[PDB]
Amino acid sequence: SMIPDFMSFTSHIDELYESAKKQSGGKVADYIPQLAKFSPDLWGVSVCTVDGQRHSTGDTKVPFCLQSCVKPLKYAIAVNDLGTEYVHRYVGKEPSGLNKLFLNEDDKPHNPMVNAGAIVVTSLIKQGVNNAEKFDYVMQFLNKMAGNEYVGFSNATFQSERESGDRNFAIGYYLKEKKCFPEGTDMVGILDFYFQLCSIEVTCESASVMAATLANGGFCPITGERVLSPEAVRNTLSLMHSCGMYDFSGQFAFHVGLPAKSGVAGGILLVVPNVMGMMCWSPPLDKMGNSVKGIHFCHDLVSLCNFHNYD
Amino acid sequence: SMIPDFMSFTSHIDELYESAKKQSGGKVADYIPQLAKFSPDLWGVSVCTVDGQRHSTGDTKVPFCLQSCVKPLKYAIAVNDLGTEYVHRYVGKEPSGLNKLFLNEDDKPHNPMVNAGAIVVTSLIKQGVNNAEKFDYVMQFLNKMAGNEYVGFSNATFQSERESGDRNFAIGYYLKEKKCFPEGTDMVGILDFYFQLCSIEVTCESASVMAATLANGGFCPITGERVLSPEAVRNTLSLMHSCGMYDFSGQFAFHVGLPAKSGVAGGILLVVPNVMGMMCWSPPLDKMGNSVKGIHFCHDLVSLCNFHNYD
Amino acid sequence: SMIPDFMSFTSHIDELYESAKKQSGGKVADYIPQLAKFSPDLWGVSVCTVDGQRHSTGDTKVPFCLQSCVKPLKYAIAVNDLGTEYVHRYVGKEPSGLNKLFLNEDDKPHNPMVNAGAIVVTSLIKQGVNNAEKFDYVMQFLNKMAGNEYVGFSNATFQSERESGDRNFAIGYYLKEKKCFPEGTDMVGILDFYFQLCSIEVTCESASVMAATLANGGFCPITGERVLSPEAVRNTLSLMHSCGMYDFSGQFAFHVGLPAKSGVAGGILLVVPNVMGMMCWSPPLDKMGNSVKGIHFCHDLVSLCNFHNYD
Amino acid sequence: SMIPDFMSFTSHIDELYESAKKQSGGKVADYIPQLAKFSPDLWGVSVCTVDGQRHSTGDTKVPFCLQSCVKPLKYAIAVNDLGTEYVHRYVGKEPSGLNKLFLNEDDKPHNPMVNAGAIVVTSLIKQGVNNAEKFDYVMQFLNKMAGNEYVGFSNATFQSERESGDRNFAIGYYLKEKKCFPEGTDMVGILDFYFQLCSIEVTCESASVMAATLANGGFCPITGERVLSPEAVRNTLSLMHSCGMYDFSGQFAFHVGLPAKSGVAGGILLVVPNVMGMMCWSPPLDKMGNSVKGIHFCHDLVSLCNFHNYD
């Protein structure tokens, strides 16, 4: 551990937080009202070490949707219950070029971090049981990852995403055309389960616990229990490292060097292997679709604490 | 007219027909039973001059679905009722590269001869009225083009295409995502109208009359009536010339030089400007998706009668 | 012939010429001084019917480089001496998608109308003999096409194109890498021959005679002699129809419907099959790289005289 | 350090070495004789810890060309003398899609690990001085990285690469066309310097010392001296992680999780951050172009010692 004095570290976290606060650029997602609602000034950062030590600053208790931030999580869950080999017969393992085809060279979604990928992954989890049951399974799972902290749902977001995601339906039908789903999959039913997962709510605080779980080889820092298999955690981290920041993934892997995953709600699930989990949140996104204050913060954290993968 | 002696010409048509008959290669489409049914040995060629003169050989009275062969026709109808400018605010005017994106540089289907294009075009025809009425409108229209000859429908084909076209639905949703349809379009309703049009039935004989209509500047050779506007006919011919033979369009424009349009049913709508209309039909298709006997025939017709656009 | 009264037709040509004259937009090519020199106001149109009848208006006697306009010509020459089959073992027969790869699916230049294509074609003509001799062979050939009218050379242009064409050298080496040239080809020597051909000079008047030759099935309208084989002329026309106006080829084939070929010098070699040959010239080019006044003129000519391929 | 007992670790290295030895597949590069020469049975593995501890097994003293393995090294050198900002005004920082364009969206080579990238990087090192001097500069540099161990040159390889690299010349001219080189660069001279660098020779033993240098934050394990800046080492490692195994980079980052770089000579420069440097060598390559025995070994090393970046 490179964090000898937590107290001092925390003091630095608040300095970075304050430094980022001055970054007012970016635009709040507004393709649906449930996202337009949010104030551009909300800005929260929560830390949770592998030690179990916590620290928050800013709006770390205001609920918000995981959206794309859930992709790493449901993928981790799939590997946990099905293993690397099986999950990857349906989804790739690397970033794509850039326009934006749904499938790769082998008629499989490039990776679990893109829509097509997350949709296929969603179709692997808890096959057989009905949607209601599948959703409880993932919720219970997310609860263990967060050590029983805040994990809600947003029905308004769910209804808006469903009655608006024409591109996800396009992807749904295309994958069904290319036989990308396991035998006998209710494609439309899957997209529904998919929209629901994107609607799960968390707070910087509860999310940081989930990130810390991934930073602690699958053991929840605040309960000590094994939630995800070592295999599942290593895969999730690798993929977050290469494709978790949309079109910014390259720049991010080169300059920040940490496993992260952004969401349109403005959140950024950050993981510092064997050190801590983190969740930055600020609604204003840049052109790439990442939280402006969040990206700023991440670069600052790595310059200051030499947390970069290769330091 | 390069056909001084119709009698002799006909004798040559039968020779080419017999020559093509020996081409047994190709595979009959079988993605649906209604197409698998067909015998690979069916082979028919019907001619209809701008003069009104007719001639058939082979299975020219066995009904079969137009399928893609209807694309040029419904496009002609759109230009006829809306004019070049309007129709092309929604669909392109040239062939694409090759994989196979749904939209081009300007978020419009490349041309009316590809699925995405034909789907958008379908959404322009007779806007407002219900589907049943739209279908009668096109049927009545196709009747005038065929001079009241055989124009049927295949409900079995229609039902199979609908409960099987996942890729067309994918295209449907994608176009709806990119705002490619006119304001307030029932996308799913349009795909239904689209599947129905693909299910319209004709015979080499009735189809050749439709082709002759396009070969006669919009006037049906056997009734003398104006069916399509000059503007509409010129557009349809240009596009059939550059993108009517799927991936073979280039080779076809270079070696045959005639406006044509193939269909998965094995038909090839051929037009020899100011001379005649033609419909070759033979279920076995090659890798490109064109009738094997039909392609052979077309090359032979141009070598023998110097009908190539630039002879 | 749709030109009953040449006198009246000529009167219309001058009206279109005057109408186009008002189009002052576009920018004169300036990648080399020999092209920057030209006045944006130069504008000439020369007609030469299959009959042998002539007519000029504007700056039809000011020499200018063929540049890309020579591509159709040297291609015609290759087919004439080697036949379709041989020439096309090295170059494609259709337009490409759009970035801009040097080779297609089969490691062959897409068509003779693009740089890579024209370079490969250049390597087929008069193999064996030295460059000086090859150049005389093509010059003598171009002379017959122009009926002995103006055909010059521009050494200043040649020297500038050679000491500046890094992209053509890149293409040269790439093709050499993919074994695109006939056995034992001096690649660098070929690029030199290529640059020279681009530097050949003509005038609207002499060029229109060359165009008329292609419009007359290979027979020079003003000498009556056979210059190009029927086979060679049909191929050249087909390719000019689909890929002779750079990225505008699609729009041009759909709206104008005539075999044409533009050049960076501002010229447009136009052919109206079995009617006449033409050469419009005006240095200012549009974004696509075609003569602004020339494009305007071509659209006007087709609207007024219904010369479109499918009228 | 996860290597408590070096003795035991070494015993495991020899077991993996022996296990890999049984992998006889792959084909020895043969585009030039200097590579065809090599026996498919040569197989060597050399380790060099950050501690300075060494260990070899197999043909670890047979000289071979770095080839692509030098790309990470000359890139490290550029960052060391010019800093991240400057070097990256000319070359990208991420993997590309897949065909294989020379430049990316911003007209810059995708990254330093691809030919176009390595060529641009080569043009940044020691600008001004002549080629002979530039080469000595890099040689002296490579010597410090190897702690003065074997670093040779192969004139036969150099001469063959130069008189055979048409694709590198194509790339050279294209980059020169797009103004990718610093002001006043002798492009052809640069390609020469480039071919020379690819011809530098090493042995598993000396190379492993170079890898260990990168594994030790820029300090040569066997001399203790600072050779590369921390900044330069972190960049080199990140890029080796994402694009050092050609088309296998994705699979490699996901399954092995270590910074590596392969070469057509059959070598694989491997780095285990803060632990050791390594060089596996075996001439037979797979379709991707990586050493077959080397790839096998790398997967085995990570399964056995949990060296994967995220374990």
Swiss-Prot record, chains A, B, C, D:
Tissue specificity: Isoform 1 and isoform 3 are detected in brain cortex. Isoform 3 is highly expressed in astrocytoma, ganglioglioma and ependymoma. Isoform 1 is highly expressed in brain and kidney, but not detected in liver. Isoform 3 is highly expressed in heart and pancreas, detected at lower levels in placenta, lung, pancreas and kidney, but is not detected in liver. Isoform 2 is expressed in cardiac and skeletal muscle.
Residues bound to substrate: S68, N115, E161, N168, Y194, Y246, V264
N6-acetyllysine modifications at: K93
Effect of P95L: In GDPAG; loss of enzyme activity
Superkingdom of source: Eukaryota
Result after altering K71A: Loss of enzyme activity
Ranges where the record places region Highly mobile activation loop: 97-102
Mod. after translation: Synthesized as a 74-kDa cytosolic precursor which is proteolytically processed by the mitochondrial-processing peptidase (MPP) via a 72-kDa intermediate to yield the mature mitochondrial 68- and 65-kDa subunits.
Family according to the record: Belongs to the glutaminase family.
Domain notes: The C-terminal ANK repeats prevent the assembly of the supra-tetrameric filaments.
Known disease link: Developmental and epileptic encephalopathy 71: A form of epileptic encephalopathy, a heterogeneous group of severe early-onset epilepsies characterized by refractory seizures, neurodevelopmental impairment, and poor prognosis. Development is normal prior to seizure onset, after which cognitive and motor delays become apparent. DEE71 is an autosomal recessive form with onset at birth. Death occurs in first weeks of life.
Job of this protein: Catalyzes the first reaction in the primary pathway for the renal catabolism of glutamine. Plays a role in maintaining acid-base homeostasis. Regulates the levels of the neurotransmitter glutamate, the main excitatory neurotransmitter in the brain.
Assembly behavior: Homotetramer, dimer of dimers. The tetramers can assemble into rod-like oligomers (in vitro), but the physiological significance of this is not clear. Interacts with RAF1 and MAP2K2. Interacts with ATCAY; the interaction is direct and may control GLS localization, negatively regulating its activity.
Protein name, UniProt field: Glutaminase kidney isoform, mitochondrial
Organism expressing this protein natively: Homo sapiens
Gene behind this protein: GLS
Shown part of the complete sequence: 221 to 531 of 669
